[model samples]
Target: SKELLAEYQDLTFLTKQEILLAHRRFCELLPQEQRSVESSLRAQVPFEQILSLPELKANPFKERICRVFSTSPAKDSLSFEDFLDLLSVFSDTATPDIKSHYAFRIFDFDDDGTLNREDLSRLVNCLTGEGEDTRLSASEMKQLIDNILEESDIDRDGTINLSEFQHVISRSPDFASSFKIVL
Candidate 1:
């Protein structure tokens, strides 16, 4: 147990205390049948339960967050280690570089390695909220997409790659502070 804590501290940006607290929170999400340390490691928390966390409860991109972190075959659950990885990256101490990287993954909804027109549209939708009344009009959406591509699509390939996304994030000072979830 000591070694595992040491390992997590080394592998993640989280401190030992944060890691332990994260474990407690994660254990709370598991059913009694899978509560033991050994089974907890083997357990997979359903996306529904993961979404219940206050940090994610009202988050529009909750499903996307879970999907990006999940390694389960169903792509709808998170193992304890996956949960740890989510917390580590979302933790306040995580670097802007790491934060932006994961942000890119979360925004790239199609998981196609690039933010294409469709991906950008979906991202904007999430930002504006999923309600029909909240979504931008067709022309507004198109204009916004054009402007985003003009600014971030460095290669002019009509898509935003990781490097392009990171470049935009580098100029955004607010990202480091806003892109965090505390335990």
Candidate 2:
């Protein structure tokens, strides 16, 4: 228990109501069988359920987003802890730095602390909407990616690191309010 405590320790940023709301969301997503597994605060949410979320339904990269949030080694579903981490960033109280920090984790498909060109493209897809009828055309996606790399990939390293991602978010006014779970 101590192991996880330090990682989440001194975290007073959330109000009691927010924490309760997070737990409520967790219970709704957790399966009946997994409800009593207190040894680890985990709940498996399948890809289908993730897509059903109003905020996530149109995201073309919903599958990837779910996998990224799931702490499972298999990355098939999310745990309670994982969900909380996801919410903490999206919370209205979270600062732009914190929001962007978690946003990077969300977009970091490879979990390598950096987003490669492919990962960047996926993020763009999320931003532009990934529905079959709404997705960016190949040319548009390429041009946007090219523009992103031109601006953020300053070292020409062909990847967007956390620092770069944070820099981009710092200037984005919506980044702070971009994530919020209703209900």
Candidate 3:
């Protein structure tokens, strides 16, 4: 509807200019050939069609203020593979620094590298705001551990090395940047 389009147009959260800027930033992050293809696609696709696409459905840009900053705990915490899948939707290069930052944010349960039940509990609590009473149960913790071990442990070892961890973080949209300026 025109009303909907107008709403999206009037959105003060991010100007059309900002959206275009983000699109260009995404293109810059792609390889040369991929960039060419993406440019062609953008030229051909209408803004409405692009907006309605399923892949763009999860765009954080369209999120409302509450949804954008919601403190609700993730009901189903993403496994390492799930995290990677989300990242894969954006860019391919997961730099070491980027990965470390995400790992630090997601896995530093106790401000420590090794994640234990306590750390997982704290993370869940912090996200959900459910407090200590609503923390993850032992079974849920075991399930999360099993999922991580099954999907992320590339060497069949018990631990996820820094390299493996960083690989996942590099794909997140949250980490997407417009430009890098070095002084």
Candidate 4:
């Protein structure tokens, strides 16, 4: 059990480092055209402050756990049962307006009528509570876009359509679960 714990701890550290490194590398590879806009947006927020919080200083796994717990302070903290509840909701076949909202939000990323890597990364980071200063680099943005394209691009197009977008959002339990916690 101790070995398992140690392994988990090591993995957790590695995950955090990967996320930070990815974020840094993404910024470095950001498109020159978008650099000014991204930088200006990042400058407005105390992104470093959020990253430096004690809760976030732990391994990335712990930070994610804390983010989930902090999402609903008024309620008893989420247990394994809560995670199940989340899975059930995500599994529900019902179509909700929230799905449309998510689609619209993603589509609106560039306000140019097409979903791209930049939009996807910006949205994911924002949803994950990454601050403005923690902007996604170009490569990271492209990676996120590729991930979405692979998972949700039902028509096999490089871009996400409305239906694909909704499906992706609904399938992701983390997205819905975080909403319950944060809102």
Candidate 5:
């Protein structure tokens, strides 16, 4: 246990205490049969259950968040290790580069390396629900997407690559603070 704690501390931004807390939280999501340390390493939790966590409960991009971090073959579930990885990147002490990297992944819905028009549209929709009263008008959405591309598409490509996304993130001081999760 001590050896594993040391290893986790060395590899992740989380402190020893946070790791313990995270382990407890992870176990809380598992059934009794899979709650032990040995089983935690191999057991998987469905994305539905993970989304029920208070940390993700009200998040606008909860499904996307889960998909981006899921390591299962179908990319719909998370092992305890995957859960830890998610926490590491979202931890307050995580570096800006690491944070931006995962942010790009979460926003890139198509898993296509670059974020395209449809991905951006879906991202905006998640940020604002599709209900008539809350969603943007077609013209407004078009202009918004156009402005986003205009500002972040440095290579003049129709999509945004990771570097371009990070460049935009660099300008937003709030990103580091807002892009975080806690035990």
Candidate 6:
């Protein structure tokens, strides 16, 4: 596994500036009291601020997406590393492999390395705006869920694991752009 990461590192896909900007962007958007925390030895973004981030708000599934990036159980905070890890995948220049990997994590509702039926349903609901006043009809939602499972349930196991998700993503040219976060 280290060897694989080494190969990607050899790609030198990102630099300090990129990660620095990410931190700055997160900090600049921090609340007024945030200065105290940011000045502390172990600087971290307050979890609440992350939820309201402009870049995140641009994504329809912001709530679900926020949960996945956070390693914290309460999803209340993010270390600098956590912040950068998220930024790398969301970066405009990120490779498809990296983007797809993070996308799977974001969509894996249970963080169990796979997506079950309920997870898939929630994903579709987010895309469809969660039955808002002008959202998809019940029947329409069902058809989409069915079609998604039909296409990506490669092993017919009724769940989407990482590899399966990667396969599905490869076919979508717009996934990279659609998932991008510009600040």
Rank ordering of all candidates by lDDT, starting from the highest: 1, 5, 2, 6, 4, 3
Would you list the C-alpha lDDT of every candidate in the order shown?
0.69, 0.64, 0.38, 0.42, 0.69, 0.62
* Residue-by-residue lDDT tens digits, candidate 5, 64-113: 77677664355237665666788788787777777777778877886778
Better of 1 and 3 by lDDT: 1
Error of 2 at 41 (Å): 6.5
Give the per-residue Cα lDDT of candidate 3 at 164.
52
- Model 3: lDDT of residue 102: 43
Each candidate: RMSD to true structure? Answer: 4.0, 4.7, 16.3, 17.8, 4.2, 6.2
Better of 3 and 4 by lDDT: 4
Tens digit of lDDT per residue, candidate 2, span 1-183? Answer: 102343543353567677677767666655443445544443355565455547875556566657666644642467655666666665666677776666777778778888888877766766665345344465787778778877998667888888787677766657655766563
Task: Give the clashing pairs for model 1.
Answer: none
Candidate 4: misplaced stretches above 4 Å? Answer: 1-95, 125-144, 171-183
Best by TM-score: 1
Candidate 3 runs further than 4 Å off: 1-106, 109-118, 129-142, 171-183
User: How many clashing pairs per prediction, in order?
Assistant: 0, 0, 3, 4, 0, 0
Question: Cα lDDT for residue 84, model 1?
Answer: 77
Better of 1 and 4 by lDDT: 1
lDDT of 2 at 116: 86
lDDT of 2: 0.64
TM-score of each: 0.75, 0.67, 0.30, 0.31, 0.74, 0.68
Residue pairs with colliding backbones in model 6 are none
In TM-score terms, candidate 1 sits at 0.75
